Amino acid sequence: TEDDQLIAGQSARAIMAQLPQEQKAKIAEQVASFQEEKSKLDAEVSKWDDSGNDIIVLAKQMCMIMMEMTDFTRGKGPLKNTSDVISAAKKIAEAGSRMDKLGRTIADHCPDSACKQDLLAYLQRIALYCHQLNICSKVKAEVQNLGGELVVSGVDSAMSLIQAAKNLMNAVVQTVKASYVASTKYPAVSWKMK
Amino acid sequence: SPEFSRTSLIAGQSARAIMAQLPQEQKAKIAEQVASFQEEKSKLDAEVSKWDDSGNDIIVLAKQMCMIMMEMTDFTRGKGPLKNTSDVISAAKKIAEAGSRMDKLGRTIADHCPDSACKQDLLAYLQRIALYCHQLNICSKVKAEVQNLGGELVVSGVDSAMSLIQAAKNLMNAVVQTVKASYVASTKYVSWKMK
Ligand SMILES: [Br-]
Ligand SMILES: [Br-]
Ligand SMILES: [Br-]
Ligand SMILES: [Br-]
Ligand SMILES: [Br-]
């Protein structure tokens, strides 16, 4: 069942590690773009103490699984086969579903309409990009006929996966910010500065 | 480009699908090997045509091995029922178990043969059955390879395919020689009924 999922006879991560430099460089540019969004999330969560704030806890744990996926597109990290990437997406979607519950509780107890709506829209983005990560995690690198050779291309699947993670990262940042704001207009979530 | 299909369900390109689109330079070397395999398989067709399969489990087993072996050579061309590497491996396993059963029956025929030369000839061919079954098992596990060349990661299935086919060709030749020799060693005193 491991050899069910090989591409051209090798593990998915091994294929990413052997992609031609041009593909690897296009992937690296997306990864660097991803690290900018991770920078915004690190700066936001570092404002808050994670005791009694599972939103912050879940944000950090979603971010750390996305880094495993980001590493996978470079042929590194713990995710070896497609099934591992799928399962990592699944964990992220679970954490997002838990973040969405907490966030909706905060929203319902908020009577500031514009703050309510902003929070709820960011929680839709969490759902959207958790789904997108699930979808993108099932797209394997592909084999293409080019000039009488069979060549491996994984750049498109890697970049779509990274792009979904970038967007999810941004949705988490907005959700953290908007959850704190909505709370100050009211709690299972304590917003203690660090 | 190789056909996408549902794999274990998400889209993927299976080993059989990859064989099916190998560059025609790779496919030409494989066809050459399959042609010489076909020659050996003819010789089995002629030999087992000459006999009735009732009570002759030697001949029953020989057509069983031939049919699975054709599934394997078809795989190297992107055809037949073996889709995944694990299918090629399990096909080699069932060939090996058939060969085990053929070896068993063969060795009892040999041990009841009073012509010493004919006994030894039969036993020699049975040794080839056992060696070539093991060797087909080995070759069934060889995967395609990828190599960074030309600024591309390029796929090649030539070497696993040719190795699989040469293994099946050796075993095919051993099986037909084993039938011819099982009968000869039977003449010297499993039913060898024609038609
Ligand atoms: Br390169
Ligand atoms: Br490219
Ligand atoms: Br609340
Ligand atoms: Br297929
Ligand atoms: Br054939």
Residue numbers in the entry:
A (entry chain A): 658 to 843, 855 to 862
B (entry chain B): 648 to 655, 663 to 843, 857 to 862
Q: What does the original paper state about this entry?
A:
The cadherin-catenin cell adhesion complex is the major building block of AJs, and has a crucial function in the dynamic behaviors of epithelial cells, such as cell polarization and cell rearrangements. The structure of α-catenin (100 kDa) consists of three distinct domains. The direct interaction between α-catenin and F-actin was demonstrated to be a catch bond, an interaction that is stabilized by increased force.
To better characterize the αE-catenin actin-binding site, we elucidated a crystal structure of αEcat-ABD-WT at 2.2-Å resolution. The electron density map of α5-helix clearly shows that V796 adopts a conformation that exposes its side chain on the ABD surface, along with two additional hydrophobic residues L785 and I792. Our observations of the cryptic (attenuated) and exposed (activated) conformations of V796, despite the nearly identical primary sequences of αEcat- and αNcat-ABDs (87% identity), indicate that this residue resides within a conformationally dynamic region. This internal cavity is partly formed by the side chain of M673 from α1-helix, hence raising the possibility that α1-helix unfolding allosterically affects the F-actin-binding site by changing the conformational dynamics of V796. The equally significant reduction observed with either the L785A mutation alone or 3A suggests that L785 plays a central role in establishing the critical hydrophobic interface between F-actin and αcat-ABD. The measurable reduction in F-actin binding with I792A or V796A suggests that I792 and V796 are likely involved in further stabilizing this interface, and any changes to these residues could modulate the F-actin-binding activity of αcat-ABD. These results confirm that the hydrophobic residues on the α5-helix surface constitute an important binding surface for F-actin interaction.
